[PDB]
Amino acid sequence: DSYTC
Amino acid sequence: DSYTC
Amino acid sequence: DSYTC
Amino acid sequence: DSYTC
Amino acid sequence: DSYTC
Amino acid sequence: DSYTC
Amino acid sequence: DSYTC
Amino acid sequence: DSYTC
Amino acid sequence: DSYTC
Amino acid sequence: MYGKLLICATASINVININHYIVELKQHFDEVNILFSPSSKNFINTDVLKLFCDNLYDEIKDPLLNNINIVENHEYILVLPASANTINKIANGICDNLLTTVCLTGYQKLFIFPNMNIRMWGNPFLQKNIDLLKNNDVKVYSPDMNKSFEISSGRYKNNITMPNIENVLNFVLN
Amino acid sequence: MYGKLLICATASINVININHYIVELKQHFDEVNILFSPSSKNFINTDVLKLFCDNLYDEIKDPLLNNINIVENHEYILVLPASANTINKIANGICDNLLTTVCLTGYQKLFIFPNMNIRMWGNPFLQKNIDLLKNNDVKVYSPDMNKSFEISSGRYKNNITMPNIENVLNFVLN
Amino acid sequence: MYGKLLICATASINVININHYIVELKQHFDEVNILFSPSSKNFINTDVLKLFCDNLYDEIKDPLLNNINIVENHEYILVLPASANTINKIANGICDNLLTTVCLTGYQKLFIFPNMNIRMWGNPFLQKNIDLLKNNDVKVYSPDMNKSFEISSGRYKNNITMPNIENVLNFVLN
Amino acid sequence: MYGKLLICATASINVININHYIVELKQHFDEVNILFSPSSKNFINTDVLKLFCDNLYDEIKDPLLNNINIVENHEYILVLPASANTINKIANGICDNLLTTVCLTGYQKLFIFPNMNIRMWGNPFLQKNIDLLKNNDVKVYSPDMNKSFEISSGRYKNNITMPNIENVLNFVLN
Amino acid sequence: MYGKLLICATASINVININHYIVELKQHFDEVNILFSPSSKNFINTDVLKLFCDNLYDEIKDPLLNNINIVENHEYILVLPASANTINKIANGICDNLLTTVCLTGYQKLFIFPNMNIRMWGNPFLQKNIDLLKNNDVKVYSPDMNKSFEISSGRYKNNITMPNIENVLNFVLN
Amino acid sequence: MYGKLLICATASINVININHYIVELKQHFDEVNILFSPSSKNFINTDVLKLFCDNLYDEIKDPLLNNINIVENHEYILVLPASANTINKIANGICDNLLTTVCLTGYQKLFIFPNMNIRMWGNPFLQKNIDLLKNNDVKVYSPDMNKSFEISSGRYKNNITMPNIENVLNFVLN
Amino acid sequence: MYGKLLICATASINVININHYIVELKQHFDEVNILFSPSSKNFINTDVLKLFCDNLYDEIKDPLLNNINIVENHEYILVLPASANTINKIANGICDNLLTTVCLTGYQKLFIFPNMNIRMWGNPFLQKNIDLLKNNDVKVYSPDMNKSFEISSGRYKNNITMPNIENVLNFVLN
Amino acid sequence: MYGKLLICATASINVININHYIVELKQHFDEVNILFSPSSKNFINTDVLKLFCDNLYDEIKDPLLNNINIVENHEYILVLPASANTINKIANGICDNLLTTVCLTGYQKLFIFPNMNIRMWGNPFLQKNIDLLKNNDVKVYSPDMNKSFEISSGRYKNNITMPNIENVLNFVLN
Amino acid sequence: MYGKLLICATASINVININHYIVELKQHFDEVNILFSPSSKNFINTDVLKLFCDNLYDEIKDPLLNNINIVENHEYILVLPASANTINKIANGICDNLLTTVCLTGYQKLFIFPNMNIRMWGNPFLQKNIDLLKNNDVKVYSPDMNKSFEISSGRYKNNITMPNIENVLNFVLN
Ligand SMILES: Cc1cc2nc3c(=O)[nH]c(=O)nc-3n(C[C@H](O)[C@H](O)[C@H](O)COP(=O)(O)O)c2cc1C
Ligand SMILES: Cc1cc2nc3c(=O)[nH]c(=O)nc-3n(C[C@H](O)[C@H](O)[C@H](O)COP(=O)(O)O)c2cc1C
Ligand SMILES: Cc1cc2nc3c(=O)[nH]c(=O)nc-3n(C[C@H](O)[C@H](O)[C@H](O)COP(=O)(O)O)c2cc1C
Ligand SMILES: Cc1cc2nc3c(=O)[nH]c(=O)nc-3n(C[C@H](O)[C@H](O)[C@H](O)COP(=O)(O)O)c2cc1C
Ligand SMILES: Cc1cc2nc3c(=O)[nH]c(=O)nc-3n(C[C@H](O)[C@H](O)[C@H](O)COP(=O)(O)O)c2cc1C
Ligand SMILES: Cc1cc2nc3c(=O)[nH]c(=O)nc-3n(C[C@H](O)[C@H](O)[C@H](O)COP(=O)(O)O)c2cc1C
Ligand SMILES: Cc1cc2nc3c(=O)[nH]c(=O)nc-3n(C[C@H](O)[C@H](O)[C@H](O)COP(=O)(O)O)c2cc1C
Ligand SMILES: Cc1cc2nc3c(=O)[nH]c(=O)nc-3n(C[C@H](O)[C@H](O)[C@H](O)COP(=O)(O)O)c2cc1C
Ligand SMILES: Cc1cc2nc3c(=O)[nH]c(=O)nc-3n(C[C@H](O)[C@H](O)[C@H](O)COP(=O)(O)O)c2cc1C
Structure with missing residues (x-):
């Protein structure tokens, strides 16, 4: 699972 | 210019 | 109970 | 007052 | 000897 | 006299 | 038992 | 004036 | 170059 | 329930029991x-x-x-x-x-409860200041005398004692 | 250019602007x-x-x-x-x-410029000391009243304000 | 009252007077x-x-x-x-x-107010970057020239000076 | 098994999952x-x-x-x-x-996998540098767009996502 | 040999020679x-x-x-x-x-031996306190004047000097 | 004896021998x-x-x-x-x-003597910056090639070497 | 006033009174x-x-x-x-x-004033070194014997004592 | 039970077993x-x-x-x-x-038990000092030779060994 | 290539150039x-x-x-x-x-290269030790005299200088 601010 | 609590 | 030196 | 080195 | 500022 | 990694 | 370097 | 152990 | 105090 | 109250606790041996006062007073003041x-x-x-x-x-x-x-x-x-x-x-x-x-800053809302050895209490300079405080509308409670445990000798002699809650409340609210 | 001057700055919120005074005063005193x-x-x-x-x-x-x-x-x-x-x-x-x-040590060359909330200024004990200082030749400037930035609200109100340079100079040199 | 504003203060000698700006700007922006x-x-x-x-x-x-x-x-x-x-x-x-x-991250809401010695201001590399910033929609204010108190010598000379509030507001809001 | 590989991990929120990549890549590179x-x-x-x-x-x-x-x-x-x-x-x-x-030092063996918010990705200066890197033979992977968990709003919005292993391998080996 | 004696030493430049007093006094007091x-x-x-x-x-x-x-x-x-x-x-x-x-606490057994520059000695506030101390039975010795080695200039001038042991003993025991 | 000279030493393995240059240069510059x-x-x-x-x-x-x-x-x-x-x-x-x-600040009096591995020297980005520096009147010396001690092997090989004093002097004074 | 003098003070209980010597000697040596x-x-x-x-x-x-x-x-x-x-x-x-x-380095200008318990003074190895020092032109003063304060008992006894200023001056200048 | 005894233990690998000696000696000396x-x-x-x-x-x-x-x-x-x-x-x-x-200070009550590698024991300077010690009435025990565990090679070679208690007692008491 | 060599470097101002020796010696000794x-x-x-x-x-x-x-x-x-x-x-x-x-421990493989001011070199005690070292088979090189850059004054005078590599090698190998 990728994250982003 | 002047400060107070 | 109160204390004293 | 503004300042400069 | 005694001293003073 | 000269050095290199 | 004695030791030595 | 002088001290010793 | 060599140095001395 | 009255208004918010602030306790200014100082270095008296009795500060170790300040929690008893907090709990008691919390039953009478919003904060x-x-x-x-x-x-x-x-x-x-x-x-x-x-x-x-x-x-x-x-x-x-x-x-x-x-x-x-x-x-x-x-x-x-x-x-x-x-x-x-x-x-x-x-x-x-x-x-x-x-x-x-x-x-x-808050001298107008100040209530002082002295606690110390009776010997310290007798200090001339301390007493002059207590008069000065009273003569300038700072409320200073009169220390109670009674059985106090003297850590020095481990004896239960008579000396200045901490105020009970009824007296604290009455001195502050009246 | 007058003689060397020393600033004794204390913990008033206004100490953060002490640099403005240093620069101004440096135009009138050797040091x-x-x-x-x-x-x-x-x-x-x-x-x-x-x-x-x-x-x-x-x-x-x-x-x-x-x-x-x-x-x-x-x-x-x-x-x-x-x-x-x-x-x-x-x-x-x-x-x-x-x-x-x-x-x-230098009470004889002392010039005091009070700064604090008007409420603190009204403290009885503070005022008795100010009289005592004045009655013993220590120069104490009378705080100016005017518009001020109240940090708690971020809005302006009337209160004690810092002295402008003209007043500082005049109080010190006259 | 406009929207929330953020000040990104850097290591210029003038950062010591950043409080004057905060107080002024607080009169025009929600935060x-x-x-x-x-x-x-x-x-x-x-x-x-x-x-x-x-x-x-x-x-x-x-x-x-x-x-x-x-x-x-x-x-x-x-x-x-x-x-x-x-x-x-x-x-x-x-x-x-x-x-x-x-x-x-916020280049689109960026407003830059340069402050430094005129000599630094003349740096070729700095200037190429200022053009690059402007050519890419980053608002860069043009430094004002005027009497600046040079710290090297306690003398007021001509150099880059800090922007007054009117100019800051006008550059940011217009 | 190919030659030794070095991972240069930077401060992206996704660095917390760098271990998944290490384990995967260890199945294809000597070190x-x-x-x-x-x-x-x-x-x-x-x-x-x-x-x-x-x-x-x-x-x-x-x-x-x-x-x-x-x-x-x-x-x-x-x-x-x-x-x-x-x-x-x-x-x-x-x-x-x-x-x-x-x-x-190793620009000739460099493979860059960008990761950041799409908003940061749009920065003009960043983009000019990415072109400069590509025009000088530094391999820069094109960020993938997809469902990403946005820590800011806790929503699964569309944004730049981390590259899966197949894409990493293919970009590096081909 | 008299009773136990306590020295309360303060930050006077002369505290560096306090050992001379300890040794002398140890010849007259139990402790x-x-x-x-x-x-x-x-x-x-x-x-x-x-x-x-x-x-x-x-x-x-x-x-x-x-x-x-x-x-x-x-x-x-x-x-x-x-x-x-x-x-x-x-x-x-x-x-x-x-x-x-x-x-x-021990104001009743207190003996004070002042030491400071004559200029400090002249402070109005200090003097009012010295009177207050004396008027309340606190023994305050009258500073001796004599050749004192002034540290400002390596020259022996006239100023307040430390009390010799005879005077200390006489002031304390009589 | 020419004017005062400043050495800006950076993190090159050769900085350990910077003292040899200081002593040499001190024979030609006031400071x-x-x-x-x-x-x-x-x-x-x-x-x-x-x-x-x-x-x-x-x-x-x-x-x-x-x-x-x-x-x-x-x-x-x-x-x-x-x-x-x-x-x-x-x-x-x-x-x-x-x-x-x-x-x-002093780009106009700047003289740069590059030192690094020949491999680092070949970096595209480094080279573009060196051209930019030269095209903007910053004096950049051309690194000498010669025999050098390779710390990893402890043997000598051809690579970029430090400039001898004659070359330093000639590049700075001419 | 003679030339500059240096005191090399070591860990003897008497080092606590070294200030008395500094002040005395300052009346006879430039520094x-x-x-x-x-x-x-x-x-x-x-x-x-x-x-x-x-x-x-x-x-x-x-x-x-x-x-x-x-x-x-x-x-x-x-x-x-x-x-x-x-x-x-x-x-x-x-x-x-x-x-x-x-x-x-300065053995030629060295003047040694021993101070220690008489028991330590009797150490064979110490004494051989004292002879060696004297036989090589290093001036070693002969310790004075007299009444001394014994820290362990707090009473006075005969032992090695510190040299008075006359003796120091005479040993150094003659 | 003889008088009080003091052990001065130094940095020999054998100091790790000093407790065995303390316990043994405690059976023969008051302290x-x-x-x-x-x-x-x-x-x-x-x-x-x-x-x-x-x-x-x-x-x-x-x-x-x-x-x-x-x-x-x-x-x-x-x-x-x-x-x-x-x-x-x-x-x-x-x-x-x-x-x-x-x-x-206590050279007159000193008993030395050397412990070190036989190679160190052969040092000329060490040996001259051992003679000097003996010729000045300092008791120096003659190291015992025997099977010692050599931490260096893990072998039980012949070398200087620690003295057993009987020998310690006999050397000290006789 | 001779056997492994150990350098024991001490606090001489010349220790700052010890790297030159390491590099040179590494061309002649295994380690x-x-x-x-x-x-x-x-x-x-x-x-x-x-x-x-x-x-x-x-x-x-x-x-x-x-x-x-x-x-x-x-x-x-x-x-x-x-x-x-x-x-x-x-x-x-x-x-x-x-x-x-x-x-x-290794006095038998010891080679000493003295470095210090000529004045220190003249110390009687130092010289007696140098004789003692030589008379006991410890190799002590005789310091070279030549132009040495005196740090007290930026002037090249005559004093003890560091040994060049040829002399080091010859003294150690012959
Ligand atoms: C164990 C002990 C108990 C003390 N009890 C008292 C006390 O009951 N009343 C008091 O006025 N001072 C007492 N003192 C002395 C104060 O702690 C001391 O005067 C202190 O400096 C006061 O500081 P404060 O006003 O900031 O609390 C005591 C000191 C100690 C170590
Ligand atoms: C943010 C803030 C601002 C303050 N402003 C003042 C002020 O204007 N005047 C004042 O007398 N005290 C002010 N005080 C209280 C003083 O800092 C406090 O009484 C302090 O102990 C004074 O110490 P000083 O005399 O060593 O400077 C302020 C305190 C804080 C935390
Ligand atoms: C006393 C002093 C004043 C300075 N004044 C300035 C200035 O007005 N403008 C500037 O650009 N740099 C100035 N500098 C240099 C900066 O502090 C320095 O370049 C710094 O690394 C910038 O870091 P920053 O961008 O993180 O604030 C000054 C430095 C000092 C020590
Ligand atoms: C919680 C958090 C997450 C971040 N995520 C990113 C990211 O995904 N990509 C990015 O380029 N920077 C991201 N940043 C900003 C970088 O950490 C920051 O620019 C940093 O200075 C980069 O340093 P580095 O290049 O040495 O890693 C993040 C910062 C924080 C605090
Ligand atoms: C070198 C020096 C010497 C001082 N000499 C004196 C002195 O003789 N008498 C005095 O009253 N204060 C003297 N002062 C000022 C006091 O140290 C200072 O007022 C201090 O706060 C007093 O604290 P105390 O009462 O806790 O000792 C001296 C200060 C220094 C730095
Ligand atoms: C042992 C070693 C030697 C280095 N030698 C060099 C060198 O000769 N030239 C260079 O440009 N960088 C060299 N580097 C890399 C730099 O130290 C590194 O890029 C550093 O961040 C530069 O910082 P500076 O510009 O503040 O000096 C070396 C690093 C190490 C650990
Ligand atoms: C309280 C006390 C007093 C001492 N008095 C002396 C003394 O008068 N003379 C002496 O030679 N050593 C004396 N010693 C022992 C020295 O301090 C000790 O040998 C020390 O290592 C000497 O170090 P130095 O030569 O660097 O001063 C004393 C030790 C202490 C703890
Ligand atoms: C593991 C190890 C064991 C040692 N064994 C000895 C030993 O048996 N005898 C000895 O004289 N020195 C021995 N040494 C060297 C001493 O510890 C060293 O010379 C030290 O500086 C002596 O200091 P001291 O006299 O204050 O104990 C040893 C060192 C280490 C690290
Ligand atoms: C800047 C400076 C340079 C020195 N140069 C020398 C020197 O060339 N030779 C020397 O024998 N001592 C020299 N000394 C004195 C030694 O550093 C000093 O005697 C030290 O205690 C020796 O310790 P070591 O034997 O553990 O290295 C110098 C001291 C300093 C501060």
């Missing part, structure tokens, strides 16, 4: 907050009082606490226990720590 | 040196003032600074801003830090 | 928050600014501050005073501290 | 070593990676690590995740930490 | 113990005095020293050298350190 | 002062250079060193050895430490 | 400077001596003090009080601290 | 106290010996331990194990730590 | 390892030498380094530069640090 003198931290872990009082003012955690806000936020300010040192600093307008600064 | 109270270091990095004043007296860098030399090296000593605490310490001859020690 | 470059902490105690601004972003107190949230929370981001270093870092997309990271 | 940027240490305990990679280069444990040896010891150098800051530093030849120094 | 003000520790290593006096009271080593016990354990308490600061604190009942707390 | 990059302190104890150069500028000892004064106090400023990092920072106008700040 | 052995710092705060001597050489403040310069700057070098340890180190040419290094 | 060289603390936790010996002299816990009292309090002083370094320091009268100071 | 005296660490960052020598023995990193192993691992042990202090300690068998302990 009971506390502020300690730097030296009283040698007697207790002030952190634990966060579990009993609404707010703990810590000048080390926050060196820029607004003394004006603190005074305005309370209707009553109690110096309990009040040490000879703090009493004398207040009387001379000395405020070199947050507690004394708050007491200078 | 403008500065000395801070321990507590004022919580408001500003005193190190930066070395870039504006001729000399910075730091009791931490040098715990053995000669207060007699400091007093003899200046023709004028200003407590600006002067806190209620320092004013009261000076009035009682208390000198437990370099700043107050310098003020006790 | 005025501040964020300092690591180096500016050598000029002032940033802690005191908590008393003037709504929020102080401290990357040391909290190393995991979300730059995206910070940028989204403001309508205007001002680099004031803006150092040559930060201007050049922004121009090259370099963001090795929170301040520059915020500036990279 | 998988890692090197972190100083800031990424605020996101993870880099020490634990010693349990997955063959070697961990720590510039704090050893400030005199030979960047030339590091570059010569590997056939592939991946900046993953690659932050906007590191990408821009590499493009400008800035190398003020071990990671960027290694990237300058 | 000679010492207690220093926090500031005097900047002038001497108080630890060495443990080799001359019977007991050294250290409030840092033990923050909970019972001032009542200390006062009860001695027949005489000497403030020597007595600084202007400590004299003024005692006069106002201020006791924010162990030394002054002991002096407040 | 030879030195300023180090933060990273070079990992290679040598910069304190010892105080024994050879006239002045050592230490941004840690004094964080408020005036870069304008430093630049004005010298006729020549040499970056020797000049690292790829510092060269690239100067080219982009980046000045996040005292050394680079001095180089931005 | 009286002092240098302490590392161990003597456990007996006194050497910092305070800065108020009496012209210069204080501190190897901790400055680890790179030039012993040759120190020796050349003085016409006389006194080891006072001289401990058995330092005497024996000098005799064997051992110089593992600044004081002993100065004594080895 | 067995111990004193360690600074370096021996790298071999053992000296604190644990407080559980076996009557008193532990720690120069770090108390830097002002009276060596004269220590020597007077014992009838026998053993250097066991005695290192080459301490033996040589004693022979030259060097006493730069408490242990060697005690040995210089 | 060149180094060991510093505690004091020499005030002149250089010993850590960097790890890049030139095969092994760096650090008694702080490892307080339990086996001196016997160190001596057995080398065919030659050079004290270079050799300070007066270390020379004298070796001569007296004093070994209170790893370097001197190694020299005592």
